[PDB]
Amino acid sequence: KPTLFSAYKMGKFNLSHRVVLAPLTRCRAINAIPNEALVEYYRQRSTAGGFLITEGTMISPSSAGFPHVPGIFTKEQVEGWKKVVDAAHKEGAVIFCQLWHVGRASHQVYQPGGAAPISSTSKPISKKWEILLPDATYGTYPEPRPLAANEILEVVEDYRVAAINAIEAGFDGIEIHGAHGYLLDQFMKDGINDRTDEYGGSLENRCKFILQVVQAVSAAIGTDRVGIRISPAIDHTDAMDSDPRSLGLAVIERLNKLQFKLGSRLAYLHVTQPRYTEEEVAQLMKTWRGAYVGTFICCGGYTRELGLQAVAQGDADLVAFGRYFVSNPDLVLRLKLNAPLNRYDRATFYTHDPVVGYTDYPSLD
Ligand SMILES: NC(=O)C1=CN([C@@H]2O[C@H](COP(=O)(O)OP(=O)(O)OC[C@H]3O[C@@H](n4cnc5c(N)ncnc54)[C@H](OP(=O)(O)O)[C@@H]3O)[C@@H](O)[C@H]2O)CCC1
Ligand SMILES: Cc1cc2nc3c(=O)[nH]c(=O)nc-3n(C[C@H](O)[C@H](O)[C@H](O)COP(=O)(O)O)c2cc1C
């Protein structure tokens, strides 16, 4: 009988419990190289048969939209990741690298040559949102440059290469970051995508880019090593869709069709709970899970009780935790014990110290 703490076969991989480390950007990978701080951070959070998803990891120089986030497009970066992955595996973890391109959610200071960030559109994120800059001030999101069709294929290739590099580093698989208003979401969401070509308009056209990515990374490393993350019901950085239910089902129908065509299942579908800044929200997530053929990871506001309930009721197979994992390196143990959870200090979510607010939250002895 499925519970939050029971084993699960995630296709190729065996898990011993259903508690997942959600992907969390933390900005400790100085100059984009995974380092000793990241090794300790993921090692602290590793459990035997526990699934870990890394922080968003750059697939290219133009991918950058936060300071000191890791990449996986150079040999130096891959060598850094090897040390992280080896340590996690020594603890018996299964670990996926999240492949991340921010699209228009960037700034000239992050872009090679100070070029404009790339996107589906020329429309910037509106001024009511600001971007954290490398000098600890907040700046304005600039006007992005809309990709030409040939250029989109180049980014698909960047994803493909990043997936190969992740496997070279020893990762068990990768997660495609298709959520939270970043590049792939800038194509999916009709509040952003104003294109009139083959990548704009219909749900078919809007889902084209992310499906090309899923197809490319699956070709590179296998369907069973690929997860995909989406967030159809949000408004973060103006990433709204007029019909989140249908958008989510459109992605899911295409994932299902691809699985049927290729003859195998993706590792999982990962969806974050609707959020704009409640029971319809609950039902939406159940509708999406019900439609997807395969493993479903839920995330967003889950607690010990909500997580137990999600797995017991069949609403999800795995439950991811973000903010609680920041402050509770041994979150799985704490959940198993119903121990109090350490409060997290949001002030150090995105600072760059390898210890302070990163690896110095205590575990239980
Ligand atoms: N994909 C990526 O690379 C990352 C996407 N992330 C997502 O972007 C959005 C904005 O992130 P943020 O860190 O700038 O702000 P946020 O997490 O939304 O928190 C802002 C305020 O909302 C509050 N809030 C009340 N409900 C909640 C709730 N369900 N969840 C996240 N906060 C909440 C939250 O309370 P806490 O400090 O977490 O207790 C805080 O007061 C979030 O949806 C986040 O999940 C952040 C950065 C990079
Ligand atoms: C500091 C911080 C960094 C995050 N980084 C990522 C990220 O790199 N990729 C991603 O898909 N989501 C990211 N998220 C969203 C989280 O994965 C997660 O969905 C969110 O924290 C909600 O789950 P929770 O209620 O358990 O915190 C981040 C969230 C926070 C607070």
Curated annotation (Swiss-Prot):
Any single GO BP term: jasmonic acid biosynthetic process
Coiled coil regions, renumbered to chain: none
Reactions performed catalytically: (11R)-dihydroartemisinic aldehyde + NADP(+) = (+)-artemisinic aldehyde + NADPH + H(+)
Biotech applications: Artemisinin and derivatives (e.g. artesunate), are antimalarial drugs due to their endoperoxidase properties; they also display multiple pharmacological actions against inflammation,viral infections, and cell and tumor proliferation. Artesunate may be a promising treatment for COVID-19 mediated by the severe acute respiratory syndrome coronavirus 2 (2019-nCoV) (SARS-CoV-2) because of its anti-inflammatory activity, NF-kappaB (nuclear factor kappa B)-coronavirus effect and chloroquine-like endocytosis inhibition mechanism.
Record keywords, A-Z: Cytoplasm, Flavoprotein, FMN, NADP, Oxidoreductase
SUPFAM superfamilies: FMN-linked oxidoreductases (SSF51395)
Disulfide-linked positions: none
Function: Involved in the biosynthesis of the antimalarial endoperoxide artemisinin. Catalyzes the double bond reduction of artemisinic aldehyde to produce (11R)-dihydroartemisinic aldehyde. Also able to reduce 2-cyclohexen-1-one into cyclohexanone to a lesser extent.
Identification of the protein by name: Artemisinic aldehyde Delta(11(13)) reductase
Lineage per the UniProt record: Eukaryota, Viridiplantae, Streptophyta, Embryophyta, Tracheophyta
Gene this protein is translated from: DBR2
